[PDB]
Amino acid sequence: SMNPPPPETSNPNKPKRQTNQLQYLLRVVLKTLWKHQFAWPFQQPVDAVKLNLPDYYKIIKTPMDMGTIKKRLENNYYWNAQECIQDFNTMFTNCYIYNKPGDDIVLMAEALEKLFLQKINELPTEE
Numbered sequence: 544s545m546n547p548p549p550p551e552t553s554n555p556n557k558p559k560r561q562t563n564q565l566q567y568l569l570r571v572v573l574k575t576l577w578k579h580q581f582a583w584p585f586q587q588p589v590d591a592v593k594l595n596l597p598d599y600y601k602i603i604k605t606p607m608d609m610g611t612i613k614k615r616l617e618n619n620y621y622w623n624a625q626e627c628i629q630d631f632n633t634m635f636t637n638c639y640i641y642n643k644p645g646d647d648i649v650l651m652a653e654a655l656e657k658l659f660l661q662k663i664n665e666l667p668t669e670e
């Protein structure tokens with residue numbers, strides 16, 4: 544078995560911006576979700592070897608996780624909040640693709656995604 548390289552968290556040639564909305568996504572949205580009792584499976588890339596999910600990266604070709612998102616935010620990786628929101632949506636969608644309704648992991652994602660949508664319903668003003 545073999546895990547792939549994890550998603551990049553630094554890229555000097557990518558254009559970057561420190562937006563009020565991006566700061567909010569790190570200080571409030573990510574840090575709040577991070578402390579949820581159901582966040583731990585999402586705090587790092589899937590270790591398919593450890594978890595004995597040898598088919599995970601046969602199915603999931605755009606992996607994402609909150610640890611990667613947290614690093615990108617702290618390293619000022621994004622140009623705008625929509626880029627970061629899209630990473631969150633990739634993380635949730637990957638879980639719904641690989642797993643099935645009713646699985647414990649899907650219940651955890653469903654709960655986190657509802658909280659996620661509550662927190663981003665209102666972002667601070669692009670002053």
Ligand SMILES: CCN1C(=O)c2cccc3c(S(=O)(=O)N4CCC[C@H](N)C4)ccc1c23
Nearest residue numbers: 584585589594596637638641642646647648
């Ligand atoms: C979110 C990424 N991701 C998956 O797609 C996925 C599929 C099956 C298990 C599993 C685990 S686990 O084995 O540690 N465990 C966590 C909580 C209780 C669940 N029954 C499974 C951690 C993170 C995972 C998975």
